[PDB]
Amino acid sequence: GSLTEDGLSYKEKFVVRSYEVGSNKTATVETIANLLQEVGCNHAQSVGFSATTTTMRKLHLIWVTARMHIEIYKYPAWGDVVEIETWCQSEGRIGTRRDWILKDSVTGEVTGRATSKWVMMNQDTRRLQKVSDDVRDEYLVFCPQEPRLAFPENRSLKKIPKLEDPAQYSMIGLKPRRADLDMNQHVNNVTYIGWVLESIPQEIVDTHELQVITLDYRRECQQDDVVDSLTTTTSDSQFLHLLRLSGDGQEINRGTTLWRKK
Amino acid sequence: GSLTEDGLSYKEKFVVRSYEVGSNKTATVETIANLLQEVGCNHAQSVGFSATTTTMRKLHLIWVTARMHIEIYKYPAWGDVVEIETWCQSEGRIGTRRDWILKDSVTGEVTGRATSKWVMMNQDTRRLQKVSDDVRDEYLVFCPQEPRLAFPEENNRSLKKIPKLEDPAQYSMIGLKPRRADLDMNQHVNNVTYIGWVLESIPQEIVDTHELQVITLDYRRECQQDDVVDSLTTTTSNDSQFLHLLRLSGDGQEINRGTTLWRKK
Numbered sequence: 001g002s003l004t005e006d007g008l009s010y011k012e013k014f015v016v017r018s019y020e021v022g023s024n025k026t027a028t029v030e031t032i033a034n035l036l037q038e039v040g041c042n043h044a045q046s047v048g049f050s051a052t053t054t055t056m057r058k059l060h061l062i063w064v065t066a067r068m069h070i071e072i073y074k075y076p077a078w079g080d081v082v083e084i085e086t087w088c089q090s091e092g093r094i095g096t097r098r099d100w101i102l103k104d105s106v107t108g109e110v111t112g113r114a115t116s117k118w119v120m121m122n123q124d125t126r127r128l129q130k131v132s133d134d135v136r137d138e139y140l141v142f143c144p145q146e147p148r149l150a151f152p153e154n155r156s157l158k159k160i161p162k163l164e165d166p167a168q169y170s171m172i173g174l175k176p177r178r179a180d181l182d183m184n185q186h187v188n189n190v191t192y193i194g195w196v197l198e199s200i201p202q203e204i205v206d207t208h209e210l211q212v213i214t215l216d217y218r219r220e221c222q223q224d225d226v227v228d229s230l231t232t233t234t235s236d237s238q239f240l241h242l243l244r245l246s247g248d249g250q251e252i253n254r255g256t257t258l259w260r261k262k
Numbered sequence: 263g264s265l266t267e268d269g270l271s272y273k274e275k276f277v278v279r280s281y282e283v284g285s286n287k288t289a290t291v292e293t294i295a296n297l298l299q300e301v302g303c304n305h306a307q308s309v310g311f312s313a314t315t316t317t318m319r320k321l322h323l324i325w326v327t328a329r330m331h332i333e334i335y336k337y338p339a340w341g342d343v344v345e346i347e348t349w350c351q352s353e354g355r356i357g358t359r360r361d362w363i364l365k366d367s368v369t370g371e372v373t374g375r376a377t378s379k380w381v382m383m384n385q386d387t388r389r390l391q392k393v394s395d396d397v398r399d400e401y402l403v404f405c406p407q408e409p410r411l412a413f414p415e416e417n418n419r420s421l422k423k424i425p426k427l428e429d430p431a432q433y434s435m436i437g438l439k440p441r442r443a444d445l446d447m448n449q450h451v452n453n454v455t456y457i458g459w460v461l462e463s464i465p466q467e468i469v470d471t472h473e474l475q476v477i478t479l480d481y482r483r484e485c486q487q488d489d490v491v492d493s494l495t496t497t498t499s500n501d502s503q504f505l506h507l508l509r510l511s512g513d514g515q516e517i518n519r520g521t522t523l524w525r526k527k
């Protein structure tokens with residue numbers, strides 16, 4: 001992996017592994033999501049980050065994902081090489097955005113694209129706050145200043161409603177194991193993708209390919225929490241999703257998926 | 263990755279990823295186990311398998327893991343490059359063995375080693391059978407003929423007998439269910455998920471103050487996609503040892519048994 005010539009974006013190549021593929025011998029959406037996180041982390045490292053800036057560490061501030069949107073045209077096959085380009089952009093005082101472009105290394109064609117919105121919050125109180133000018137001049141030097149959108153047109157900005165009971169489908173009692181946690185003992189965001197997809201019926205997974213997924217992150221699931229995954233068909237096939245705590249029903253995530261017939 | 267010069271073993275390098283590490287910023291045992299599987303799969307592909315031979319595919323036969331033994335001296339850090347060498351050996355008509363050696367690419371020192379015993383089984387009936395001459399002659403050309411053991415020692419931990427944990431267990435984690443990410447390309451539960459499930463009943467305080475040095479797992483039965491498992495652990499012991507058992511949540515049918523050895527950080 002390396003920063004591009006202008007130092008305003010980062011590229012990395014990955015060879016798809018045997019345990020990273022599903023029944024179609026192609027990478028799952030969770031493997032793609034993991035690769036997006038890995039390339040984002042390598043970009044932050046290459047430009048001297050933790051991605052907390054120097055003023056953020058003093059103030060105990062962190063970037064947290066508010067929304068993630070992924071669109072896949074072709075899932076790479078086991079053994080294929082995928083190239084991913086990522087970059088960040090400031091969204092004024094609202095927060096920041098990280099975008100990605102996925103390409104087949106052999107053909108050079110765009111096989112997927114993703115976008116994510118991040119907000120600043122105090123690490124301890126979990127309270128959101130606007131982006132200060134001091135904590136903006138430090139990260140703007142690593143971002144392109146003219147607009148550069150992975151989704152210029154679109155589905156990434158759609159409003160997501162709250163699923164109403166009764167749900168058409170459900171998977172209950174979902175619990176994270178130690179492998180679902182990151183280096184800071186927080187549940188990895190890719191686990192929420194898996195949990196959302198668990199309530200899609202197996203027949204849909206067997207006859208369709210996931211083309212679009214949009215997730216809004218509302219609250220974190222702790223290590224000792226138990227989650228219920230709820231899905232209702234809103235339609236290609238479209239679904240409305242909701243993850244909530246198994247007991248009191250407190251919302252953790254909401255989302256939408258769009259699936260195409262194979 | 264590539265076969266070595268003699269074509270009797272295979273090496274591959276991996277750079278440890280951010281999501282592959284735990285609290286110490288080092289690879290978890292599940293990441294190591296995943297890498298062992300990946301290098302084994304690349305070795306079979308390099309020598310023409312897909313690891314069923316031509317006679318095996320004709321008779322609906324497959325290799326299945328009976329026992330897995332891993333010993334880790336140093337877990338690689340996030341960003342470190344680890345080199346893994348793997349090879350197979352015939353164990354007469356009993357079955358086959360796949361061994362691995364893990365090294366730090368920078369220092370060249372052995373940071374870990376693993377061994378696994380595989381048995382031949384009919385894919386549909388799940389009935390075991392001894393290795394015939396026709397199958398043996400097809401895979402022996404890809405194996406070193408003189409002994410090559412990752413665990414040579416005459417009284418090593420890889421060959422120890424594992425007893426069945428007796429109720430009541432000291433610790434337990436109940437209601438464990440596999441999700442779609444725990445399945446392989448053939449919709450079977452990945453063996454690395456059983457490692458995770460075994461480790462779930464180790465108390466968090468032990469995980470926080472110790473590093474896992476050795477893990478031995480005996481595979482008895484496969485967990486289906488709609489099965490629910492209970493993970494049971496009892497301390498048997500500067501070092502801590504545990505006896506483990508995974509069984510079906512309902513009738514208590516055994517799926518796996520194992521042992522772990524942990525050392526103080």
Ligand SMILES: CN(C)S(=O)(=O)c1cn[nH]c1
Pocket residue numbers: 033034036037038040065067068069115116189190
């Ligand atoms: C791709 N998603 C899983 S995400 O946008 O939540 C993300 C990206 N880097 N870290 C989290």
Ligand SMILES: CN(C)S(=O)(=O)c1cn[nH]c1
Pocket residue numbers: 295296298299302327329330331377378453454
């Ligand atoms: C390392 N283990 C998880 S294993 O020995 O069960 C194995 C190795 N390749 N496939 C399974």
